[PDB]
Amino acid sequence: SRVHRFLATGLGASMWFWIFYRAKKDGPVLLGWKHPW
Amino acid sequence: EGLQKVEVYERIKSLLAGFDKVNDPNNITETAHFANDLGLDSLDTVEVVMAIEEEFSIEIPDKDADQIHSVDKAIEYILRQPDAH
Amino acid sequence: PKIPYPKHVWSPAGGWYAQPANWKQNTAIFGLVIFGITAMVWKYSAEHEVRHKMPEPDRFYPSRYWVKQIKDYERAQKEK
Amino acid sequence: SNRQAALSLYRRALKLALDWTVHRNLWRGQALYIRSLFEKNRNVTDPRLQRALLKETEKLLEKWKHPDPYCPPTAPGGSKYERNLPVPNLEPPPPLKF
Amino acid sequence: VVKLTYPDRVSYPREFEGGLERELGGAGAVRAFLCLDD
Amino acid sequence: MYLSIIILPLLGSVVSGFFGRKVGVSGAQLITCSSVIITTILSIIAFFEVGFNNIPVTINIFRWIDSEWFIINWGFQYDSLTVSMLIPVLIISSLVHIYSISYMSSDPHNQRFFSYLSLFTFMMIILVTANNYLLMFVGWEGVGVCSYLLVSFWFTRIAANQSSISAFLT
Amino acid sequence: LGAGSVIHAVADNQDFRKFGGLISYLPLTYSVMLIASLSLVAFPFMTGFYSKDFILESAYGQFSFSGVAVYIIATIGAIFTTLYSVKVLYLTFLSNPNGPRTYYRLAIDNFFSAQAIKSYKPAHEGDFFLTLPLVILALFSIFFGFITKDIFIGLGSNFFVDNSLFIHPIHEIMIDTEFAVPVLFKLLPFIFTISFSVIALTLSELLSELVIYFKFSRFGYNIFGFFNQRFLIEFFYNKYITNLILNLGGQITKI
Amino acid sequence: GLQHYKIAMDPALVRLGSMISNRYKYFRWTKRTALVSFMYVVVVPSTIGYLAYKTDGLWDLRAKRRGDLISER
Amino acid sequence: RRATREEMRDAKVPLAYRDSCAHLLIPLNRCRYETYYLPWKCEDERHSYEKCQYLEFKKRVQKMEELREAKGGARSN
Amino acid sequence: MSLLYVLLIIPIIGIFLISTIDSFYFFNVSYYKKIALITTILNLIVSLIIYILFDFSNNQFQFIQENLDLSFYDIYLGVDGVSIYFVLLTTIIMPIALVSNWNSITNNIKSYLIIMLLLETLLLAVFLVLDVLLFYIFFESILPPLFILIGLFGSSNKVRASFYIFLYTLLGSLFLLLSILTMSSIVGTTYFDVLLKSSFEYTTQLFLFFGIFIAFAVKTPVWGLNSWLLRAHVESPLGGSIVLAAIVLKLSLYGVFRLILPILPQASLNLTYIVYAIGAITVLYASFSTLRTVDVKELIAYSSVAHAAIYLMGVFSNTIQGLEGAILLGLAHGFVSSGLFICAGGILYDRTGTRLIYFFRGLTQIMPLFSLFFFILCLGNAGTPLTLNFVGEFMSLYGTLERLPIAGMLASTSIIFSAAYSIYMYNRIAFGGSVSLYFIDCFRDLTKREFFILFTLVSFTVILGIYPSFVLDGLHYNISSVVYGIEPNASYLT
Amino acid sequence: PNITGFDMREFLRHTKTPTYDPWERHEAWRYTGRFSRFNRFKGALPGFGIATVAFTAYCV
């Protein structure tokens, strides 16, 4: 039943990647370093 | 499907086998009295019961915690209650 | 395990571990009833659904095919 | 008398400690202090203070009583207690005209 | 503690041209801010 | 369509609860889950239609109370708020319906159970889809009775009984 | 639902005092509950982040005494939100086992002679019907917040234009929520979330002594009991509300 | 007149029903008991009645707009 | 240019955004209507609307510079 | 011949039919119940023909008959909007009351059937007579058949109960009779059409109000006068209990629509604060005690005292909403009270011989059908929506509140307190454990008889709960006539 | 203090893993490789390690 581990890491892989990918663009916005435009 | 004779005897055996205060692991049998056969005293007996119920996921009431003084009675008492996991 | 229970106790919801041998055709028989009166509801719903703003023809709109309040309007708009 | 109840205090004494300290390796050494504490009063014989000794300890169990002690689910106070209860009377009802 | 130490307001009340008299139900209703006191 | 997402969850529950003898455990699950799933699919359609295109829709089946100035209808209004309300209600209810298929294969009374959750689903649509406050109170008291009926589902639990009283009475 | 599969794994136990380990035993179950908790604690760029965090800026955006006053109240509540969020994750998953052997006794070690067929039951996860809703909600708890942020929050969204949610211009705070608030307060809950969690990680499995010292102090004993027992509110409810009703009925029907 | 099912009639429960049934026969007038009878029969309804009288016709919501009062007296 | 009521009311914009800065809001509402409010297609004019709001905000906050000065830094709320 | 007199005589044929068969055919006791059951169904049919002909927008009394043979005490019959649903309710209940004791009555079956058939003729005549002396002649005539019925078929303390129902009713009525007699000496008659258009001096109205209110506060019953109800509604046989809680209780509520509202306008408007004090105190006290009641039948009986206060406050609200909801509440109360007595007095007491709630616990394990209906009936008692009981409570409470806010608010506690005893009774009997261990013998579930008298009773309360326009429609025009007051811009139009 | 010897400081002082004890053999299995501190935290963040590898690839 190794499919359970794949779903465990697969969702865990979908997460922790949506953050850095989004922090690459929206990260400078909420920090006040650069305005949204 | 439920708890069996061999299910409880060996499983409980691994509990008191870890005692460093018994005479020896080879002195435990089906009818091993807690005091006469293997070396335990009046206060260690309840300490064993604390272990038994914790690893059987049940409760041992004080009324029924005193008739329990031998491993033989442990087998018959637990099989009486199907609340065992 | 399985809890013992009386065998005389008639339940409308079934009883303790109820399942008939014919749980499928009976399920199919009941399933037709739900569908039958659902579209019966859908017919009455499609006939009484009243609106005031009309959708653009381009936009995705599933109800353009069954409801009346705009089907007549759409063909009325198809007159010029 | 003065013997059956004495073990009962020790039965709950270490059990009470475990329900306060979730990490039971802390509780593991906790029992030894409880154990050695019992061993100190070994050959106490006169019931006059022996009864009073049991009264005094019962006071501190209440003074350290847990807000909610652990109970297994299939136990009074457990989660699964009296959950799926079979009917006490399995025999069918007798012939009566009602 | 918060009452003695809390920041004052930063932005002025929004100025709405005409006071939104008509759109908010007429004169017989609560109006917006239009060149009033502050 | 908009009145259908009110009827389907009701229909699964009566067959699950009043004819659960005649559809069996697995039939009660299949009927009610499908009814919820079907209601789920049309709910997301209404969200795409009521909100995105900005068309609120009105249904007035018939009158409920009619006394002088007081005309309360069994009437339903979909607008931007109620389609948004019906998304979490219908997505989760379906998943919980599936989650209970695994959850309660050992519980005997499993088809009285699946009717209550589909009866809960019905009254939550009633609550949010109403034209008026009084019809909302039907879904209001209806989920309250559904909650009592579920809190004391193991009614041989005295604890469930006091808990059900507290939920119902509070 | 993540907790529900946990209860099914053990013999329907619900106490944290006998929970632990289960990392290898419930990999999928741990993964989803972490995903859910992160959105619950408003970890940045999650489904719960936009929804839960915006509140505080909206609370602070209304530059009044009450708005700032509840910002502290909400933040300290958010601090304790982190504490139990890791407490569920730690005690059930990221800690030493605290249950009996049967919860963790796998089949890798023999440990059995004539009972190899049975008696293992080492808290396996559920079947397809139990895990499918977990995965479905897991996707929503990650992405659904960002996708619909303009749908509901936006800045000048015209989604609610049939007078479904009426807002009066006299107390608009939407523009002040994004502009007038200082940057520190916008990211302040993020600072508290990442910080106050590690103290819990430090106080358990790293020291595991300060919490015990704080428990047994007379001042610390009652604060544990008082909060455990729900601020004694039900005590004040049963004795002075419902038992009062049950005795007024007793006085009327006897005297 | 018909016969019913067989019941484990509990004399303690049976006798408790007898006393509840027959309690009316043993009531007496006391300093306590007249005070209880006086509070719940006289004082309390007199309190509601006094408030009902004192606030009768006082309010009316029917169509009172902004700038008008709920009160009528 | 500024948006008059007769043309801006027909746009059906919220009450709180009926300000004179909503000229750029009418095209913004269209794009969300065009692409189901997806927050990765209307990025350009979304920023364009925030221009006027941000520029207005600075003019507004700079007004407090003399307003709270007249009160000697007192409490304005 | 008037259909109304058809309603009054068919039960007399049944009595005559029942008593002479023994001279025709040891005739089996089954036959006389067959005649009694059929006779009530015929009354139901006629009353249903009358409703299908009834006009909902006519002031004149309908289905009247020419007499032109005036004596000193003639019997006139009429059917308008307010009285028709009360007649409709009586002819619906009576078949169910006989079926509820189909097996429970063993000895004196002829006597039981004759009383109830007589009891039906007397009860319909109350809602049909067209003057106030006739109203009193028939509202007090039920006492001898009720006295003998209780002490011939009652429970252990039937003697005490029969003496309580007879001596409280007689006393309250005598105070009512002194008021009716004063009216007739002023007006010179009692005929509704003549008497309604007479006015009265303010002092006369106040003293006429008392006597009538003494009478209706005994028969409501309001708390403190309610001890006859706890005895005579428990010790009665089940059919008598059904008639006493579904029909007899509602004669006083109808007596406000003929004797208090149209002829004592000023008196009612100034004495409402007394009535609402009594009514709110009644709701409040009758709820706390029924929370502590051990007799299962007495708990159901004494919840009627709780609900009868709500519709008593609705008829003194001078509001078209309160008056209508009051009739709806007393109409729905007849269905739910009837079912609850069937559940307690007919289904538990038959099987167990006891009514002590101590002996009952977890019947849902053994009685799935009984638990079902006993749950809808408990919800209706709690005024849960989808039930006509809810619509009556809601409409009465709005009227009570709109007339006197503090009293309606103190009445509005009923939502909290009626659910308290209705669900506390439900979880103690149906739920709360596996089964009571005092049952040394397993119980059969509902029979087909039990399943059908309950199915009807909850059917009426539910159907009229989704669509109460069936009753509300014919009530509107005639109940408009019993309001008192005017608007500054709609009075004296010229 | 009390007739029974019970010191709060001494009670709290013994709150540690004891050097000697008759119960390690029954409680040793918990503090092994299956539930060691390093192995417990081996999968605290399941996909974090894999995600970073893909993240760096996207940047480059």
Ligand SMILES: *P(=O)(O)OCC(C)(C)[C@H](O)C(=O)NCCC(=O)NCCSC(=O)CCCCCCCCCCCCC
């Ligand atoms: P075996 O050991 O069974 O023989 C027992 C004998 C018969 C010797 C008895 O123990 C006996 O007669 N002994 C003398 C009297 C007695 O009962 N002594 C036992 C010790 S009493 C004592 O010392 C009082 C305190 C006991 C410890 C209480 C601990 C409670 C919990 C503390 C922590 C709470 C917070 C976690």
